[PDB]
């Protein structure tokens, strides 16, 4: 899903939701 951000949250570097 496209919920991850990269401006303030960033969530995580190596995510497993897309890759």
UniProtKB/Swiss-Prot annotation:
UniProt tissue specificity: Expressed in the eye lens (at protein level).
Subcellular location: Cytoplasm; Nucleus
PTM statement from Swiss-Prot or TrEMBL: O-glycosylated; contains N-acetylglucosamine side chains.
Residues annotated with N6-acetyllysine modification: 1
Signal peptide span: none
Subunit (UniProt): Heteropolymer composed of three CRYAA and one CRYAB subunits. Inter-subunit bridging via zinc ions enhances stability, which is crucial as there is no protein turn over in the lens. Can also form homodimers and homotetramers (dimers of dimers) which serve as the building blocks of homooligomers. Within homooligomers, the zinc-binding motif is created from residues of 3 different molecules.
Cited function: Contributes to the transparency and refractive index of the lens. In its oxidized form (absence of intramolecular disulfide bond), acts as a chaperone, preventing aggregation of various proteins under a wide range of stress conditions. Required for the correct formation of lens intermediate filaments as part of a complex composed of BFSP1, BFSP2 and CRYAA.
Recorded disease: Alpha-crystallin A 1-172 is found at nearly twofold higher levels in diabetic lenses than in age-matched control lenses.
Family affiliation: Belongs to the small heat shock protein (HSP20) family.
Name assigned to this protein: Alpha-crystallin A chain
Natural source organism: Homo sapiens
High-level lineage: Eukaryota, Metazoa, Chordata, Craniata, Vertebrata
Section covered of the full-length record: 70 to 88 of 173
């Amino acid at each position: 899903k496209f919920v991850i951000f990269a401006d303030v949250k960033h969530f995580s570097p190596e995510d497993l939701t897309v890759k």
